[PDB]
Amino acid sequence: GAIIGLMVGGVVIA
Amino acid sequence: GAIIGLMVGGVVIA
Amino acid sequence: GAIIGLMVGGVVIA
Amino acid sequence: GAIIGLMVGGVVIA
Amino acid sequence: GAIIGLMVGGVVIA
Amino acid sequence: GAIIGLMVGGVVIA
Amino acid sequence: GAIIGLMVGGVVIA
Amino acid sequence: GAIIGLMVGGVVIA
Amino acid sequence: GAIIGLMVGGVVIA
Amino acid sequence: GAIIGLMVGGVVIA
Amino acid sequence: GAIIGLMVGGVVIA
Amino acid sequence: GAIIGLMVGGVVIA
Amino acid sequence: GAIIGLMVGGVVIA
Amino acid sequence: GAIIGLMVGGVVIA
Amino acid sequence: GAIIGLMVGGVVIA
Amino acid sequence: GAIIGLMVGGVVIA
Amino acid sequence: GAIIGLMVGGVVIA
Amino acid sequence: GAIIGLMVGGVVIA
Amino acid sequence: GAIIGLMVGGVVIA
Amino acid sequence: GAIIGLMVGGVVIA
């Protein structure tokens, strides 16, 4: 999938 | 997928 | 995929 | 893919 | 692909 | 200050 | 100040 | 100040 | 001030 | 001041 | 402020 | 302010 | 302000 | 302001 | 202001 | 069925 | 089915 | 199915 | 299927 | 299928 570090407040479907 | 660091507030489908 | 650092507020499909 | 630093507010399909 | 730094507000397909 | 509706995931200094 | 509806992912100093 | 609808990903000083 | 609809990714001083 | 619809990626002083 | 009939699910600043 | 009939799902600043 | 019938999903500043 | 019938999905400043 | 029937997907300043 | 994140004000038949 | 992020005001049959 | 980010006001059959 | 970012006001069959 | 960024008002079969 996606690779994300230190994300702020977001929305993720995954 | 996508590679993202320190993202602010976003939306990600992944 | 795409390579992104310090993104502000965006949307990503990935 | 694309290489991006310090992007403001955008949308990315990736 | 494309190389862009300090992009403002854009859209990127990548 | 600022008036905001339905802000997603943000940061606000306030 | 500013009046904002449905802002995504943002940063606001306010 | 400014009046804004549906702003994506932004930064606002306000 | 300014009136804006559906602004993408922007920065606004306001 | 200015009236704007669907502005992409901009910067506005307002 | 605002005066409303039969709005579905919305958001209002008023 | 705004006067509304039968709007679906919207956002309103008014 | 604005007067509306049968709008679908929209955003309104008014 | 604006007067509308059967608009789909739009954005309106009015 | 503007008077509209059966518009699809638009943006309107009015 | 359908997969939806952060839907505003909508209607879904499902 | 369909995959949707941050939909505003919509209708979905699903 | 379809993949959609940040859709405004829409209708989707799915 | 189709991949869509930041679609305004649309209709999608999917 | 199709890849689309920032589409305005459209209809898509997908």
Residue numbers in the entry:
A (entry chain A), B (entry chain E), C (entry chain I), D (entry chain M), E (entry chain Q), F (entry chain B), ...: 29 to 42
Please give the exact wording used by the authors of the publication that reports this structure.
The Uppsala APP mutation (Δ690–695 in APP, Δ19–24 in Aβ) is the first known multi-codon deletion causing autosomal dominant AD. Discovered in three individuals from a family in Sweden, this mutation gives rise to a dominantly inherited form of early onset fAD.
In addition, we investigated the structure of AβUpp(1–42)Δ19–24 fibrils formed at pH 2 from synthetic AβUpp(1–42)Δ19–24 monomers by cryo-EM. These residues fold into the U-shape. The protofilaments are connected by hydrophobic interactions between (i) G35, and V36, and (ii) I31, G33, L34, V39, and I41. However, they all share the same C-terminal U-shape formed by residues K28-A42, which folds around a hydrophobic cluster of residues A30, I32, M35, V40, and A42.
